[PDB]
């Protein structure tokens, strides 16, 4: 029984050190293995400063706030190969730090167990596809977790503001921070965000206002795993603000609220908040689902570890994420729908809905 689990993590560092060698070989020994198109867009964007426009840019477009351009400006000096070498190492280092933060938030620590966890979960579909393009999701997750784990107002506020300046999606953590009654954190984060907007306006040729105006002014693919994507896939035409999308998001709001009320610890609350944010977002690719690792760790090591439901859900989530159902379906997706194939693009949505319902019911029956 427990004898098998004990001896596996006694040699955590070399299984982490074994998968990294395979990961750094796949990129540098396969055709189209180390293109890093997103890192290319990140770097070759701020190069057009002092001449031309950063938004009249194409790469065989840059649609990030000017604060990101200011941040990435001191990156075109370094040769691209060295930066590409360092980026992946930073990514796995951030993942290891995230697992360590989750362990400490539970109430214990173990370096070997964290190494084994990172080695096992490095190849999950969201994490697997995250570092294929060169995205920055893991760093933002690490920043949010560091802000959550801290106890000082200024540290957390500055971390949240800086994380939300570069990308506009990780501003949903304010919902959790208001839920935990940690006031003045939202105020300091808002001040930091406004200073980031001001400096972005000042550094570039007043392009931030135009960027925000254009922001207000494909989604039918199978990679998009949000409500809008699934409704559009089933219907065949764009859903938008339809007569069922309001009910579809409506009932997910109430399920998320009930599930949040069920749990009464930091990691569970932040996991439910991030799941709600993932489900509500209009465009949420599969690489945005890197938040299922802390949720899995909470399922396996949290207070509810004594139930035989939590175990079933954890194992099912692990196998489902490892298999990668939408990636498999992507080979059948038409260019622009047979219903046995169109009805399978909602597996992650139904899994999340079932998890929310189960947590809500077990929270209700416990009073």
């Amino acid at each position, epitope marked *: 029984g*427990a004898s098998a689990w*004990r001896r596996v993590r006694a040699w955590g560092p070399w299984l982490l050190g074994l998968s990294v060698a395979v990961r750094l070989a796949w990129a540098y020994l396969t055709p189209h293995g180390a293109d890093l198109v997103d890192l290319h867009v990140y770097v070759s964007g701020p190069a057009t400063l002092g001449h031309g426009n950063l938004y009249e840019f194409t790469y065989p477009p840059f649609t990030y706030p000017p604060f990101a351009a200011v941040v990435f400006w001191p990156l075109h000096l370094i040769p691209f190969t060295l930066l590409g070498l360092c980026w992946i190492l930073g990514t796995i280092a951030a993942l290891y730090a995230v697992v360590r933060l989750s362990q*400490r*938030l539970l*109430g*214990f*620590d*173990d370096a070997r167990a964290a190494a084994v966890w990172t080695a096992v979960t490095m190849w999950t579909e969201p994490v697997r596809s995250t570092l294929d393009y060169g995205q920055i999701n893991v760093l933002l997750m690490l920043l949010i977790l*560091l802000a959550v*784990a*801290s*106890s*000082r107002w200024w*540290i957390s506020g500055t971390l949240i503001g800086l994380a939300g300046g570069v990308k506009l999606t990780p501003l949903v953590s304010g919902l959790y921070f208001l839920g935990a009654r940690r006031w003045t954190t939202a105020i300091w984060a808002g001040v930091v965000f406004l200073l980031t907007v001001v400096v972005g306006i000042a550094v570039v040729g007043e392009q931030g206002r135009y960027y925000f105006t254009d922001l207000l002014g494909p989604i039918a693919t199978v990679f998009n795993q949000s409500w809008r994507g699934g409704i559009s896939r089933i219907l065949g035409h764009d859903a938008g603000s339809g007569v069922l999308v309001l009910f579809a998001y409506a009932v997910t709001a109430i399920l998320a609220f009930l599930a949040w009320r069920a749990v009464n610890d930091r990691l569970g609350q932040i996991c439910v908040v991030e799941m709600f944010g993932l489900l509500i977002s209009p465009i949420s690719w599969t690489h945005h689902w890197v938040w299922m690792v802390p949720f899995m760790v909470w399922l396996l090591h949290g207070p509810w570890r004594d139930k035989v439901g939590a175990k079933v859900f954890g194992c099912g989530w692990l196998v489902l994420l490892l298999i990668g159902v939408p990636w498999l379906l992507s080979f059948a997706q038409p260019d622009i729908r047979p219903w046995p194939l169109a009805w399978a693009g909602l597996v992650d949505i139904v899994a999340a809905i079932a998890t929310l319902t189960w947590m809500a019911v077990v929270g209700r029956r416990s009073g």
Partner: antibody
Amino acid sequence: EVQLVESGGGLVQPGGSLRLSCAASGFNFYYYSIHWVRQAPGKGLEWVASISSSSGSTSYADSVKGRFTISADTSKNTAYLQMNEDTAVYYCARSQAVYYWDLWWSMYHTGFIDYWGQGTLVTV
Amino acid sequence: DIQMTQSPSSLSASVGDRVTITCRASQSVSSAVAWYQQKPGKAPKLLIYSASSLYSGVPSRFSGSRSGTDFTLTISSLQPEDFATYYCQQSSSSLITFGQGTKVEIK
């Protein structure tokens, strides 16, 4: 449910060594911390040592002559090993840790849960 | 090391009387303070943890504290005669220190 039992009490001589044992039932050591507290006869409580049961043992106060190891998942054993102080009564308790990060990692304890154990009657 | 000081002067154990005990600390223990109750011949038992969080199952010692570097317990009633010895500790400096403080009945 949760139980803690001690057995290593005796009449050791002024010089030598002895060991203690505090077993458990109904929970797992991997998520909690174990401490030993002693009390001289006619005086107040005094803390001796602390452990994490997941990473390692520290906090040996100033009379540093004990060992205080744990054999996790092997009969749920907690054992002390003295190399000599005075007559007292020793207790074993359970606690949980809380972590915080302000430019560096600091921690404290929540407080020993009501799952205490009965004492021993060691006497030098 | 962070020392502790109390005022072992509680007496007369009159039924329904209020109780106040002060644990005067040094340095900064932050909010890592707990209190215990022990009867003669028996092991102690936790009463209040986190310096402001009351436990689960203590009906006769419903109180709190201040957490402003000085801690008090408001035992509103003394119906079961609450004859025991109460202690305060800290668990912040990687070392744990205790105190004193008993209660006696009327003559």
